[PDB]
Design a protein around this ligand. Structure first.
Ligand SMILES: O[C@@H]1[C@@H](O)[C@H](O[C@@H]2[C@@H](O)[C@H](O[C@@H]3CO[C@@H](O)[C@H](O)[C@H]3O)OC[C@H]2O)OC[C@H]1O
Length: 307
């Protein structure tokens, strides 16, 4: 019942399967891998960097990322959420400033990290680009995306660009509004969408998003996902509310070629990081035997590409 995948021949797009990804901190990733099994190690590791931070924070982010990756098995692909926000979900978009060159020094530090990493990766440039909490504006967002996409190309950087929608969290805006943020097929390697609340699975906006990704001839990555407002601690109830439709969505949409599951205690990270996820519930699959076993079982589906 897993539909054979479509192939668009995009950069780092697998021919037949779905990349297994997880995040989004070092120890949460290792806990998740120990729960699902070392033979089901994700091909994709989630990470994040804000290009408006000081150059030194870009450099330390890069150094820590290489440290983490080189202590994991060879071949893991970093999946980088690149932000340019001036506050923590306060609508403080800095895309105009980036578009005007005020952060070129940070961009150069970013390019240098990817060049030193010298390995296949993904960059979600300005991920969840239409979310009000990021506060980006369409014309400057596109100019930033095109600039980074062209720099990747010109430097032969080993990273696929990902144009990643906030989906239901941004109220599934119409296609005309989405396209205001679209830089054009020539600059975009993959589409992405992030899937959180369980009602999103049945929203017609989600199907419409897959429909137009397919006719832009782009594979879709689930750029981030977690059982928001569900968690894992209710066993079969948790599974049926979120995980069951989640894996149905992967099965039913042939253009989905990667997924990224966030294995987090959101209440902990909300207090630690200062972001508003306090009521998102506990998403650590290892904290519930039913969910862990059911999830491990889904990862045994041959469609999924581990390692
Ligand atoms: O600084 C980053 C955060 O930006 C990052 O956020 C991700 C993102 O995928 C998303 O963001 C929320 C979407 O729903 C809105 O209602 C919330 O306001 C957003 O914060 O979900 C949370 C994270 O997965 O997290 C990592 C941080 O380092």
């Amino acid at each position: 019942e897993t539909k054979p995948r479509f192939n668009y021949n995009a950069k780092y797009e697998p021919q037949t399967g779905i990349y297994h990804g997880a995040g989004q901190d070092k120890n949460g990733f290792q806990d998740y891998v120990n729960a699902v099994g070392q033979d089901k190690m994700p091909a994709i590791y989630m990470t994040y960097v804000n290009i408006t931070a000081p150059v030194k924070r870009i450099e330390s982010w890069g150094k820590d990322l290489k440290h983490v990756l080189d202590s994991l098995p060879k071949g893991i692909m970093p999946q980088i959420g690149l932000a340019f926000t001036g506050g923590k979900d306060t609508g403080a978009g800095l895309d105009k400033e980036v578009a005007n060159g005020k952060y070129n020094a940070q961009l150069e530090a970013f390019y240098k990290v990817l060049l030193d990493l010298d390995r296949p990766s993904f960059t979600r440039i300005g991920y969840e680009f239409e979310g009000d909490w990021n506060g980006y504006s369409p014309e400057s967002f596109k100019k930033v995306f095109i600039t980074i996409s062209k720099a990747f190309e010109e430097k032969n950087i080993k990273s696929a660009t990902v144009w990643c929608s906030g989906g239901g969290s941004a109220n599934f805006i119409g296609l005309e509004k989405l396209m205001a943020y679209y830089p054009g097929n020539e600059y975009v390697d993959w589409w992405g969408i992030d899937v959180f609340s369980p009602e999103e699975f049945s929203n017609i906006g989600l199907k419409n998003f897959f429909d137009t990704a397919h006719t832009h001839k782009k594979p879709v990555m689930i750029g981030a996902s977690t059982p928001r407002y569900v968690g894992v601690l209710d066993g079969e109830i948790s599974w049926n509310k979120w995980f069951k439709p989640f894996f149905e969505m992967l099965n039913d949409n042939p253009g989905i070629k990667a997924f990224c599951y966030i294995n987090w205690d959101w209440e902990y990270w909300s207090n630690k990081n200062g972001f508003p996820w306090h009521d998102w519930k506990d998403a650590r699959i290892e904290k519930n035997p039913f969910v862990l076993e059911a999830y491990k079982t889904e990862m045994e589906n041959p469609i999924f590409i581990h390692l």
